[PDB]
DNA sequence: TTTTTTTTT
C-alpha cells in the first residue's frame, strides 16, 4: 500500500547533514569511483529523516531489505552507466541498531529480528565459497541436458541433489558443473563476549558468526566488534536422525563495525597547543602521584619512532623501556592503564607465560595428526604493544626466546620439519622487582638488577624505582584519599580522545632528522663511550643500539605533536631524558 | 571471427627477437629435437606483434589454447614427421600475464579466468596417475561389452561410473580395464604467499596447486614460483550429503617459473676488473660501517670451495664460519643480509630450533598409520646456507646433533624401523655471545667460548668480536645517522646482480691447485700445527681439518674472480685471512 | 607402542 522506493531515494539526496552538505550524496559517488558495493547507513539518521521507514527496516529487514538494494541499483546505475559488467548488485548495511543484546542473554524470542552484538573476535576462518545456485546435467543416454536445479530460489546451506530431472521427468544420476556454477563468499569468525559483561565465577561463552561477500577479511583476531545481523539455528546433518534435536545458535552478519572527520579537526586543534606535549604527558595515568620522568617514558613508547626498510636490511622503530622498583611503587597500575589507552594492546605476566606461547607454538591437530603454527603473544601484538609485567620471575631460559624479537622483529621456527618466519614488531615494556625484592644501596647496581647484559642493552630506558619515605608522603597520602573520594583532576585529556590522537600520529606523521639534531646526537654519543669506558664496573653497556635510542626517541617526540621535522628541541629533549635514565642506573654523566 | 592458426603461425615463424634471430624457431627446433612437448611463450612478445591474438589469450583461454596447440602439432609434425609416434601431442604454456592477484586477495569473480599468483612452495606430493579416459566392460551373461564410459567428453574430476550398458541399453555393474585406460600424470604442490606481503599479526595463508603432465617435478620445497592457471573449486566427498555447501578452491596450473644471456654477458665483464675481489667485499652488507675481515669472510662462505668426489670416500667443499662478540656489534645483520643475497638460504635461531627440526623429523601419517620422514632445515638447505643465529642459546644436547651434518654432510636416522641417509650439503654460518655476555679480557679463551672442542674444530674460521669505545665513534655514529638519513653508498653492486653473479660462479667454475699454492699451504700448516703445541691450554686445536679448510679458502678466491687455477696470489689471501682468525683467537703467528 | 613439542605432576 505504501512504497519507500521513493522516500529511501529522497532520503539518500536530501539529507542535509552536520555540515548541511549531503554527505550520502558523497557515500555514493566515493562508491561508484572505486566500485565499494557496499553502503553504510546511519540508523539514527533514518529515524531523523522519517520515523516510519525505521521502524520498517528493524522490524521488516528480511523483506524490505532487498527492496531497498534494488532500487540503490538503478540510482548508482543512472550515475554511471559504466557501473554494469564489474558490479551486479549492491548492498545496503545498516549500523547503530538499539536493539543490543548481550551474548548470554540471548532466548529463543530473539530469533529471526535484526540485533546487534558486542563482543571480541577471537578465531577466523580462511575465505572459501558456497554456492547459492547450482548448474546440473542428467548423466542419461537420453537427457544430455543441462539446468539449475534450485529454480526460483536461492539455494539453501545445506546442498542437494534433484531427484527428478526437469527437463525429461525421469530421476538417474546428476553431475555438477563449477563452470556454470555461481559462487559467493564464506567467511567463518568466532566472537567471544567481553571480560567486563562475564559473570562472576564462570568462563565467558562464544558466538558463531558468517561473514559473506565482501564482509569476509574485514577484522582480525582480538579486535572489539559491533555485528549487527539475524540469529538462525545451526544444522549439520539434517538427513542423519537418531534425536539430537539440539540445535546451536549461529549469526548471519549484515554489518560489522571495529572499535570520522570531526575527529581529525578535534585532533588538529589539540595539537596546535604549544604545551601539548605537557599534556599529552600529564595525561598519562592520572590516578598516580609523581613518576613525572617513567610518565614522560611511557608516552614515548605509546607513539614509537619510525622504522626504516631499505633494499638491503631494515631497522627497528620501536621503543622498549624497562622498570625496576620496589614493591608497592604502583608499576603495575600505569601498566594496565597503557594496556587500555594503547590502540592495540597485549597484556601478559612473567610468570604466566611461557617461551611457546610468548612468540610461536608448534602443536598438532588432533584432526589430522599434522603440525601446524600457532601465533603467540609477540606475534598477536604486531604493530602494538606487548605488555610483560613480573619479567625478573621469567625463567631465564624461557626470557631468551624473545631477544630475536626485541631487536629484528621476527620469530623463527625451526621444529618437526616446519621452518617458517613471522613478524612480531611490537614495542615491549616490562617491569619488575630488585633481586632482594627491595632495593639495596649498599650492593652495587650490577647485582641488584640481576639481569644479562645481552637483555640488558635491547631496552632504549630502563628506570630505577626506589620508595624512600621522606617529606612528600604527606603529598602522596592527600593525593590518594582524593582520588578514593571522587576528587578528580581537569584538564586531563580523556583516554577515548587520547586513544584517536595517538592512532592518528602513527598513521600520518613521519618526522625527518635535520643537520641540527645530527650533531646535537653525534656529540652525545661520543660523551657516552668516553665516560663508559672510563668506568668499565657499569652493569649496562653503551652500544650502537644507544646511538639509535637517542634517533627514535627524537622522532617520538616530534612526532608527538605531529610535526614534520626533527627540529633541535626534539634532540635536546631526546639527550635530556637519557641523562635521567643514565642517572638512574648510577652512571654520572 | 577470424582463424587465430595463421596468424599464430606466422608469429613463430615471423617474430625478431632482440638480435632478430627469430628465437622461437629455435625453441621449435630444440622441442624437435629433445621431443620436449612443451612450448613456453612470452605475453608481451604475443602483444608487441598482435593485440588482439592476445587479448583472446587471457580472455578465451579454455577455447584457444587447443585450436593453437593443434596448429603448432601440425607445423612441428611437418618439420620433422618422425617427431610423432614420439609425441602425441604439445602444450602451449604462455608466460607473462599482466593479471597479478595476491593469495590473500582471491574472490569469486576471479574463479575461471587465467591469473597469476607468486608465492613459495612448500609441500609436494609424489607423482601419481589420473584417469582421463576410462575403459570399462559391462560383464553379464549376455554382453561381453567393452567401452570408453565418457564418450565425446573428458572424464570428470569425480571418478563416475556408466549405469546403463551402451552396447545393450542394461543395467548391472562394469569391470574397469586397466590395459585399455588412458592416464595422464598427476601431482598436488601447496604454495604459500610471501612473508612481505602477510598482514601484521596474522598467519600466512595457502592455496592448493595441481601439476600434471611435464610439469610435474618442476620445482622442490622451499623455492619461490610464479604460477599461471585457472582456478577452480575442490571437490573431496559428493557422495554424502550433510550440507557442506561450502567448497575450497584449487589452481590448474598452466605455466610455472622459479625464482638468460644477457645476464651472462653482465656477469662476464664483471670478473674482467682486476679489483673485482674488492667490489664484492664491499657490497657485503653496505649498511654495516667497518668489520672489514669478517666481511671478507662472508664473502668466501657464499661460493665456497670445491667438493671432491672419489671412488671411495668424498670430501666436503664448504666453508664454516663462526662469530662471537659483544652485544650490539650487528652480528645479526650481517646474517640477515648473508640469507637474503645467497641464492639459497634458510634462516634459524639457536632457541627456536630443535634437532629433529634442524635435520629430519619422524612424524606418523595419521590417515595410514605409519611413520614416514620430513626434511629437516639442513636438509632443505642442501647446496646453499644455514644460518643459525644465537647458536650458544641452544641446549648442548641438541647443538651435538649436527655434528655428523657439518662435516660428513649427511644426517643418519635409524628410527622407528626407518633406516635412511639424507644428504646435507649445506655451509653452515653461526653467531653467539661469550659465556659472559661480554667478553671479558683478563679471563683465558677456554671459559669465553663456552663452547666444546669438537664443534670448533668444525669450523672453518672463528672471529671474536670486542665493543671496545674509541677514536673510530664518531665516524662510526656519522654513518649510521647517514643510513638512517636515506644516503647510500654508492659504487656497490646491487644484490640481484651479486646474487646472479654467485650462482654463475657456483655452477661453472672450478679451480684447480698449482704446485706453486701447494708449497705454500704445507709450509704454513707445519709452521702453524708447531705454535699449537706450544699453548696447549687454546680451546682450539689444529687439527688437520685446517689443513682442508686452507685449500676450500684458496678455491674459493680463485672461484670469486672467475678463474680456472688457484694461482700464488690465491694462496697469499687464504693464509693472510688465516693469520686473523688465529690472532683474533688469541694464538700469535 | 613411538616420536614429537608442549604444559603439567
Ligand atoms: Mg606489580
Ligand atoms: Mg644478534
Ligand atoms: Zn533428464
Ligand atoms: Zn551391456
Given at each position: 500500500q505504501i512504497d519507500y522506493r521513493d522516500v529511501f531515494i529522497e532520503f539518500l539526496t536530501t539529507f542535509k547533514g552536520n555540515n548541511n552538505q549531503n554527505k550520502y550524496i558523497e557515500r555514493i559517488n566515493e562508491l561508484v569511483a572505486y566500485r565499494k558495493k557496499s553502503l553504510i547507513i546511519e540508523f539514527s539518521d533514518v529515524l531523523s529523516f522519517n520515523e516510519n521507514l525505521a521502524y520498517e527496516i528493524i522490524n521488516n529487514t528480511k523483506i524490505i531489505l532487498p527492496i531497498l538494494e534494488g532500487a540503490l541499483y538503478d540510482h548508482i546505475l543512472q550515475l554511471d552507466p559504466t557501473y554494469q559488467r564489474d558490479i551486479e548488485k549492491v548492498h545496503v548495511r545498516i549500523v547503530g541498531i538499539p536493539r543490543v543484546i548481550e551474548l548470554r542473554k540471548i532466548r529463543s524470542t530473539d530469533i529471526g529480528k535484526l540485533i546487534t552484538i558486542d563482543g571480541i573476535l577471537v578465531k577466523v576462518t580462511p575465505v572459501k565459497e558456497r554456492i547459492y545456485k547450482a548448474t546440473y546435467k542428467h548423466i542419461h543416454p537420453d537427457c544430455m541436458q543441462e539446468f539449475e536445479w534450485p529454480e526460483d530460489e536461492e539455494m539453501p546451506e545445506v546442498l542437494e541433489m534433484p531427484?527428478?530431472?526437469?527437463?525429461?521427468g525421469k530421476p538417474g544420476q546428476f553431475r555438477l558443473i563449477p563452470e556454470k556454477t555461481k559462487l559467493i563468499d564464506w567467511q567463518k569468525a568466532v566472537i567471544q563476549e567481553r571480560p567486563e559483561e562475564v559473570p562472576s565465577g564462570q568462563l565467558p561463552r562464544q558466538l558463531e558468526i558468517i561473514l559473506e561477500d565482501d564482509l569476509v577479511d574485514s577484522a582480525r583476531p582480538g579486535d572489539r566488534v559491533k555485528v549487527t545481523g539475524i540469529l538462525d539455528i545451526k544444522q549439520d546433518?539434517?538427513?542423519?536422525?537418531?534425536?539430537?534435536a539440539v540445535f546451536d545458535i549461529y549469526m548471519k552478519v549484515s554489518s560489522i563495525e571495529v572499535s570520522s572527520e570531526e575527529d581529525e579537526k578535534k585532533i588538529k586543534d589539540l595539537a596546535k597547543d604549544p604545551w601539548i606535549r605537557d599534556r599529552i604527558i600529564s595525561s598519562i595515568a592520572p590516578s598516580i602521584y609523581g613518576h613525572w620522568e617513567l610518565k614522560e617514558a611511557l608516552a614515548l613508547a605509546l607513539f614509537g619512532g619510525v622504522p626504516k626498510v631499505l633494499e638491503d636490511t631494515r631497522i627497528r622503530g620501536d621503543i622498549h623501556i624497562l622498570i625496576i622498583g620496589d614493591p608497592g611503587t604502583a608499576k603495575s597500575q600505569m601498566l594496565q592503564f597503557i594496556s587500555r589507552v594503547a590502540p592495540r594492546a597485549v597484556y601478559t605476566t612473567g610468570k604466566g607465560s611461557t617461551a611457546a606461547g610468548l612468540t610461536a607454538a608448534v602443536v598438532r591437530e588432533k584432526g589430522t595428526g599434522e603440525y601446524y603454527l600457532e601465533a603467540g603473544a609477540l606475534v598477536l601484538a604486531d604493530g602494538g604493544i606487548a605488555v610483560i609485567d613480573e619479567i625478573d620471575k621469567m625463567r631465564d631460559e624461557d626470557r631468551v626466546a624473545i631477544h630475536e624479537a626485541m631487536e629484528q622483529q621476527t620469530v623463527s621456527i625451526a621444529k618437526a620439519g616446519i621452518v617458517a618466519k613471522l613478524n612480531a614488531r611490537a614495542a615491549v615494556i616490562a617491569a619488575g622487582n630488585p633481586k632482594f625484592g627491595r632495593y639495596i644501596?649498599?650492593?652495587?647496581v650490577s647485582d641488584n638488577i640481576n639481569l644479562p647484559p645481552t637483555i640488558l642493552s635491547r631496552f632504549d630506558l630502563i628506570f630505577i624505582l626506589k620508595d624512600q619515605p621522606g617529606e612528600q608522603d604527606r603529598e602522596l597520602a592527600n593525593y590518594i584519599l582524593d582520588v578514593h573520594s571522587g576528587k578528580s583532576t581537569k584538564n586531563i585529556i580523556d583516554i577515548d580522545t587520547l586513544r584517536k590522537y595517538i592512532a592518528y600520529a602513527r598513521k600520518y606523521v613521519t618526522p625527518k632528522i635535520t643537520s641540527e639534531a645530527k650533531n646535537l646526537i653525534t656529540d652525545f654519543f661520543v660523551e657516552m663511550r668516553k665516560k663508559s669506558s672510563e668506568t668499565p664496573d657499569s652493569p649496562i653497556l653503551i652500544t650502537p643500539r644507544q646511538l639509535e635510542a637517542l634517533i627514535r626517541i627524537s622522532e617520538a617526540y616530534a612526532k608527538m605533536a605531529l610535526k614534520a621535522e626533527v627540529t633541535r628541541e626534539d634532540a635536546e629533549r631526546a639527550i635530556n631524558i637519557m641523562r635521567l635514565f643514565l642517572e638512574s642506573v648510577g652512571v654520572d654523566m
Open positions: 531427484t527428478i530431472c526437469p527437463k525429461c546433518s539434517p538427513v542423519k536422525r537418531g534425536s539430537r644501596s649498599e650492593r652495587p
